[PDB]
Amino acid sequence: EAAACKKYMSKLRTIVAAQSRFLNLCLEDIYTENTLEVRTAALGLEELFSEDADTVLVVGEAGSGKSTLLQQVHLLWATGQDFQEFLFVFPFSCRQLQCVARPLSVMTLLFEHCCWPDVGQQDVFQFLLDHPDRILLTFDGFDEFKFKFTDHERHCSPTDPTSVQTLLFNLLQGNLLKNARKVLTSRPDAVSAFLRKYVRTEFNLKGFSEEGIELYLRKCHREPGVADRLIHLLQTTSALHGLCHLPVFSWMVSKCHQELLLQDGGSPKTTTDMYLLILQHFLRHASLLQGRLPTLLRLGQLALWGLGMCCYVFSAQQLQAAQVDPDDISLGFLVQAPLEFLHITFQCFLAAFYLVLSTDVPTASLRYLFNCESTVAALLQKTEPHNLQITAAFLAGLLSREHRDLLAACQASERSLLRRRACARWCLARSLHKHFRSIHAMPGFLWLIRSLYEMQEERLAQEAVRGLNVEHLKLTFCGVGPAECAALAFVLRHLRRPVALQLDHNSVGDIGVEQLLPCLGACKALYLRDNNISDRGICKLIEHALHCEQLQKLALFNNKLTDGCAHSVAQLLACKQNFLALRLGNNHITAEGAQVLAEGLRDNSSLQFLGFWGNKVGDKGAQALAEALSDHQSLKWLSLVGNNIGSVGAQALASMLEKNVALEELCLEENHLQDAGVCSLAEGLKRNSSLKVLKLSNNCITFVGAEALLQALASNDTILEVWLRGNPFSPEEMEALSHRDSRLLL
Numbered sequence: 001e002a003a004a005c006k007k008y009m010s011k012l013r014t015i016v017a018a019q020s021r022f023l024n025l026c027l028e029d030i031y032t033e034n035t036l037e038v039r040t041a042a043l044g045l046e047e048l049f050s051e052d053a054d055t056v057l058v059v060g061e062a063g064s065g066k067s068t069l070l071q072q073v074h075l076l077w078a079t080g081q082d083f084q085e086f087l088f089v090f091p092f093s094c095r096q097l098q099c100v101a102r103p104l105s106v107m108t109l110l111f112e113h114c115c116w117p118d119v120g121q122q123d124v125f126q127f128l129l130d131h132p133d134r135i136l137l138t139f140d141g142f143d144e145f146k147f148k149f150t151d152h153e154r155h156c157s158p159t160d161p162t163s164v165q166t167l168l169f170n171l172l173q174g175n176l177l178k179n180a181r182k183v184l185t186s187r188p189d190a191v192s193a194f195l196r197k198y199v200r201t202e203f204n205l206k207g208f209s210e211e212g213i214e215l216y217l218r219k220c221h222r223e224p225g226v227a228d229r230l231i232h233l234l235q236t237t238s239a240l241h242g243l244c245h246l247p248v249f250s251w252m253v254s255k256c257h258q259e260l261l262l263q264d265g266g267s268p269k270t271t272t273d274m275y276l277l278i279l280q281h282f283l284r285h286a287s288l289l290q291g292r293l294p295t296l297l298r299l300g301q302l303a304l305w306g307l308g309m310c311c312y313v314f315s316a317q318q319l320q321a322a323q324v325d326p327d328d329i330s331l332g333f334l335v336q337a338p339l340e341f342l343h344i345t346f347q348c349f350l351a352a353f354y355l356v357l358s359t360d361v362p363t364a365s366l367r368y369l370f371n372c373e374s375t376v377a378a379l380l381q382k383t384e385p386h387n388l389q390i391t392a393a394f395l396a397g398l399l400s401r402e403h404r405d406l407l408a409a410c411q412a413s414e415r416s417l418l419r420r421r422a423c424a425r426w427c428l429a430r431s432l433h434k435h436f437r438s439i440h441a442m443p444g445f446l447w448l449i450r451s452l453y454e455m456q457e458e459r460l461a462q463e464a465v466r467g468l469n470v471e472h473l474k475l476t477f478c479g480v481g482p483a484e485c486a487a488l489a490f491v492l493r494h495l496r497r498p499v500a501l502q503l504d505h506n507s508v509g510d511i512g513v514e515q516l517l518p519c520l521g522a523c524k525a526l527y528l529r530d531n532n533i534s535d536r537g538i539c540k541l542i543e544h545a546l547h548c549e550q551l552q553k554l555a556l557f558n559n560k561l562t563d564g565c566a567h568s569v570a571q572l573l574a575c576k577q578n579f580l581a582l583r584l585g586n587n588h589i590t591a592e593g594a595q596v597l598a599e600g601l602r603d604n605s606s607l608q609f610l611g612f613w614g615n616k617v618g619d620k621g622a623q624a625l626a627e628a629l630s631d632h633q634s635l636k637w638l639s640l641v642g643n644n645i646g647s648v649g650a651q652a653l654a655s656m657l658e659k660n661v662a663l664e665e666l667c668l669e670e671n672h673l674q675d676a677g678v679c680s681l682a683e684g685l686k687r688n689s690s691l692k693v694l695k696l697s698n699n700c701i702t703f704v705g706a707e708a709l710l711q712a713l714a715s716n717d718t719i720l721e722v723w724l725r726g727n728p729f730s731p732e733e734m735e736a737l738s739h740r741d742s743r744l745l746l
C-alpha cells in the first residue's frame with residue numbers, strides 16, 4: 001500500500017485522463033496546433049508555462065478552441081506527456097461553479113467539486129497546503145462567473161466556508177494556495193484591469209492557420225482521398241475556407257462533409273449559413289425543419305432564458321420547467337445528469353431562432369439586440385453583451401433574403417416575419433451612426449459589421465455608411481480573421497472617402513486578403529503587419545491594387561513574404577504611378593528578390609518610403625536597390641536595417657549618394673559595414689547635399705570610420721545626424737568624439 005497523498009495523485013490522474021481522452025474519437029488523434037500569442041513570435045501549447053503572479057490567462061473569441069486547449073493540457077498532464085512539474089491538476093468549469101450558491105471552502109472545492117480522495121482526506125489536504133507550488137488549477141470560461149462587490153473581501157482560510165467567487169478572487173491574489181499555478185480561459189470582454197494585476201502571462205488564441213485546417217481535416221478523415229477533397233472544396237470556396245480558421249467551423253465542416261461534397265455549391269458563405277447546415281444535419285438524424293419546429297422553439301426558449309439569466313447549465317427541474325422532453329434532448333443540441341448546449345454559440349443561435357419565429361416575441365423587443373416591458377425584452381437587457389452580439393448577428397442572418405422561403409414554411413403568415421425583418425433592418429441601418437456618435441469601442445464596431453454582412457443586403461450596408469466620416473479605421477488586435485474580412489469588405493466597399501485601414505496584429509492570412517479585395521478600392525492605405533500573409537496573399541493583393549487609384553500605402557512588416565513576391569512587387573512599383581509607401585520588413589527577402597523587385601523601383605517616380613528592416617538583401621540586394629535609386633526623384637526614406645550588408649553594398653549605396661538628390665534618411669543599423677564601407681559612404685557624402693540622417697549603429701565601425709566621416713562632415717553642412725551608437729569604440733575614443741562634430745550620435 002501507499003499513503004493517502006500518492007493514492008490521490010493516482011486517482012486524480014486516472015479521473016482527469018478518463019474525462020479528457022474523448023470529446024469514438026480520441027483527443028490525442030484530433031488535437032491540432034492552435035498557436036498562443038502574447039501581447040507585449042508565437043508559442044505552442046507545450047510552452048504554456050514558459051506577486052509574481054501565478055495566473056496564466058488564455059483569451060479568445062467563442063469557438064476559438066479554449067476549452068479544447070484546457071482539455072489537452074489535462075490529457076497531456078494525466079498521461080505523463082507534458083506539464084510533469086505538477087503533482088496535482090484540478091480542472092473546473094466556471095459555469096458549473098456558478099451554479100453553487102451555498103458557501104464552501106477550498107477543501108470542499110477541491111474534494112467535493114473536482115475529485116474525492118478515497119482515503120485520508122485531511123492528510124491529502126494538508127499535503128496540498130504544504131506543497132502548493134506542485135498544484136495547477138484550471139478554470140474554463142471565466143467570463144461565465146458572476147462577480148460582485150460582496151465577493152471582493154480578503155479570505156485567507158482554506159477551511160472556513162464562503163462564496164465560490166470569493167474563493168476564486170483570493171486564489172488569484174495568492175491569499176489561498178500561494179504559488180499554485182492557475183490557468184483561466186476567457187472571452188475578451190471579461191478580462192478587466194483588476195484581473196491583470198495578478199496575471200503572469202496573457203495569451204491570445206486566434207484559431208487554426210491555413211495549414212492547421214489541413215492537418216485537422218487529415219486527422220479527422222482517414223478514408224482515402226476524403227481529406228484531399230475537403231481541402232479542394234475549401235480552396236475553391238473562399239468564404240467557407242475563411243470560416244474554418246475558427247476551429248468550431250472546421251468541426252462543422254468535417255461533421256457535414258457528405259452534404260458539402262455532394263453539391264458543387266451553393267456552399268455556405270456566412271456564419272448563419274453554417275449554423276443552418278449543422279441544424280439540417282442534426283435534423284436528418286431523425287419541411288424536415290417544420291416537423292421539429294415545436295422542439296426547436298422549446299430549445300430556443302430555454303436558450304434565451306439561459307442567456308438572459310446568465311445561466312449556461314440547466315438542472316433536470318429547469319428542463320421540465322422549460323418543458324424540454326426526452327425527444328427534444330435527443331436532437332443533439334443539449335448534452336453532458338445536468339445538461340448544457342453543445343456550444344455557447346448554439347445557445348445564441350437557438351435564441352435567435354426563437355426571436356425570429358416564436359409568436360410570443362414582440363417586434364419591438366428586437367431593438368434590444370442592437371442597443372436600439374415584455375419578459376423577452378427583460379431577458380435581452382440582462383444578457384451578456386458578447387452573447388447579444390452573437391445572437392444579433394444570427395438574427396440578422398436568419399432574416400436575410402436567402403432564407404425567406406425556409407422561414408416562410410414555418411409560418412401560416414409572413415406578416416410576422418415582415419415586421420421583424422423591417423425592425424432589425426431599421427436598427428442595422430442606423431447602427432454605424434449610433435456607434436460613432438457614442439464616442440477601445442472597435443470590437444463592438446466589428447460585431448455591427450458582422451450583423452450587416454449576415455443580413456446580406458447590399459443596400460442596407462450602403463445606407464449604414466452614408467454620412468459617415470471615417471478617415472482611419474483602427475482594428476489592431478481585434479480578432480480579425482478571414483471571415484471578419486469578408487464582413488468588412490461587404491460594408492467598407494461602399495465608403496466614398498478613402499480610408500486608412502489598419503489591421504496590424506490579427507490573423508488576416510491569405511484567405512483574409514482575398515476576402516478583403518472588394519473594399520480595396522475604398523482604401524488609401526492598408527496596414528497588414530503581423531498577419532501570416534504569404535507570397536500567395538500579396539500577389540493577389542498587388543494584382544487588385546494595380547486597379548485601385550486611391551491606394552498609396554501598403555505595410556506588410558512581419559509576414560511570410562519570400563523572393564517569390566518579387567515580380568509582383570516589381571509590377572506594383574513600375575505600374576502604380578501613385579504609390580507612396582511600401583513596408584516589407586521582417587519577411588524572408590534575399591538578394592535575389594531585391595534584384596528582381598529593384599527593376600520596378602527603377603521605373604517608379606512617386607515612392608517616398610521603402611522599408612526592408614530585417615530581410616537579408618545583402619550586398620547584391622543593396623547594390624541593385626542603390627543603382628535603381630541613383631536617379632529616383634521622390635524616395636525620402638530607405639531602411640536596410642539588419643540586412644547582412646557589408647562593404648560591397650556600402651560602396652553601392654555610396655555611389656548612389658553621389659547621384660541622388662532626394663533621399664533624406666538612410667537606415668543602415670545592424671549590418672556589418674566596417675571601416676571600409678564607412679569610408680565609401682563618407683566619400684559619397686562629400687558629393688551629396690540632400691541626405692539628412694544616416695544611421696550606422698551596430699556596424700563594427702572603428703575610430704578610423706568615425707574619422708573618415710568627420711572629415712566629410714567638414715565640407716557637408718546639409719546632414720543633421722549620423723548615428724554610430726553601439727559600434728566598437730573604446731571609452732577614450734568615445735570621449736574624443738564628444739568634442740568633435742556634435743552631429744555624430746553615440
Ligand SMILES: Nc1ncnc2c1ncn2[C@@H]1O[C@H](COP(=O)(O)OP(=O)(O)O)[C@@H](O)[C@H]1O
Pocket residue numbers: 030031032033034060061062063064065066067068069216247248249251343
Ligand atoms: N485545437 C483543436 N484541435 C481540434 N479541434 C478543436 C481544437 N480547438 C477546438 N476544436 C474543435 O472546435 C470546437 C469548439 O472549440 P472550443 O474549445 O469549445 O472553443 P472555445 O472554448 O474557445 O469556445 C471543439 O469542440 C472542437 O470540436
